Amino acid sequence: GVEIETISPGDGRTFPKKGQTCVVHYTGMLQNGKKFDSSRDRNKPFKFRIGKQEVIKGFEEGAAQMSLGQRAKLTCTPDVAYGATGHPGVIPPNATLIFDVELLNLE
Incomplete structure (x- = not known):
């Protein structure tokens, strides 16, 4: 169950499709926990395509x-x-994840 709570601004129409490689300034956050991941720290904003099961389902x-x-x-x-399962050492088993996601992409 993916629950979207959008901070408004953008265009609201440029929707992702198949065969589209996109760029996200994500930031990981553990619910009742601290940070665990940040593309903003590395300044390499995680170029990735859609549909090939690279990222998690959520x-x-x-x-x-x-x-x-x-x-x-x-x-x-x-x-x-x-x-x-939980990712070893980083994500505990039965964990619920929080993300700050901004899509600043192409395609």
Whole structure:
């Protein structure tokens, strides 16, 4: 269950499709926890395409429901990303994830 809470500005029409490589200034946040990931710290804003199961299931649906310039607020459920296993040392089992996502892309 991907729950979108968009901070408004953008265009609201430039929607992601297949065969489109896009750019996200994401920032990881643990619910009842601290940060764990930030593309803003590395200044290399994570160029990636859509559909090839690169990213987790929660980030995949939330990015497709956005448009250019928008700023959403993800709440990824445990069963779509890591809640069975958990990424070793970084993500505990049965964890619910928070993301600051801004789509500043091409295509």
